[model samples]
Target: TAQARDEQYRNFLRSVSLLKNLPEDKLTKIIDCLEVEYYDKGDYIIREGEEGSTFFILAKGKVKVTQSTEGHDQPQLIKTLQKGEYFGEKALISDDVRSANIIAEENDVACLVIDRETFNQTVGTFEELQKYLEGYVANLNRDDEKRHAK
Candidate 1:
């Protein structure tokens, strides 16, 4: 049972954008440290202002990214992430609290959570990882600018 679970998790990690560029051996090392979680629709995967301990990659289903409104208790949807996407990466580089909440948008949602310690000790220190993060951040900023212009 343990072996099966490990294999399944590894396979799931292989599909995520963050891990897709990693070498097989490095990916294996990462796989050893990851944990898998499942959530149902409407589940709050992460709450805004909460300290983030792990970065997540969606393996199945979808997640909605939401931020609290100025005076309303409800959160405004900022984006929706589908399979192969990830979040909480900023926490790996800084001590900042999560910027938004993540909610499961469908049933049978699967996510691979990579602990910050492992991410920094392993991938974060690598030059390739640095380039990957830089590129991802740049793209995110560009997308934000595009959205703002609309």
Candidate 2:
């Protein structure tokens, strides 16, 4: 039963563009390391400027990403992420604080979280993935500058 569950999750992971290229064993490794967490509506799953060492995959429900930019005392709404999207990688990859806030938009939202250590293990095993994430982080930095993130 556990194997079947893992297989189902593996298939789900394989569906994610970021993980599709990974080998089966690597997916199994991820399946072993990830943990699901539930959130209530209005929960701040992540906050800007916090040191974050975890990655989150949106397994269910929706979340809003907000960031502070120049000329705005309040964080500006950036976008909404739905099921299957992932975040929290920029902080870890860039070795910097979180760049934006992730707030739950509905109750019973589910997220699959991977701790930094396990994330490093799984991501490190894939050279292309590691490179791609690093590039993404670089792009995020450029965007932050353009927006005058402080």
Task: Write down the TM-score of every candidate.
Answer: 0.79, 0.95
Q: Name the 10 consecutive residues with the lowest summed lDDT in model 1.
A: 141-150
Highest TM-score scorer: 2
What overall lDDT goes with each candidate model? 0.78, 0.90
Task: Give the Cα error of residue 24 in candidate 2, in Å.
Answer: 1.0
lDDT of 2 by residue, 1-150 (tens): 998999889878987888888887778889998999999999999999888899999999999999999899999888999998999998887788898999999999999999998888888678899999888888888987988887
Quality of model 1 by C-alpha lDDT:
0.78
Clashing pairs in 1: none
Find the candidate with the highest lDDT and give its number.
2
After best superposition, candidate 1 residue 139: deviation in angstroms? 6.5
Per-residue lDDT for 74-93 in model 1, tens only? Answer: 66678999998988886555
lDDT comparing candidate 2 with the true structure: 0.90
Off by over 4 Å in 1: 1-11, 69-73, 138-150
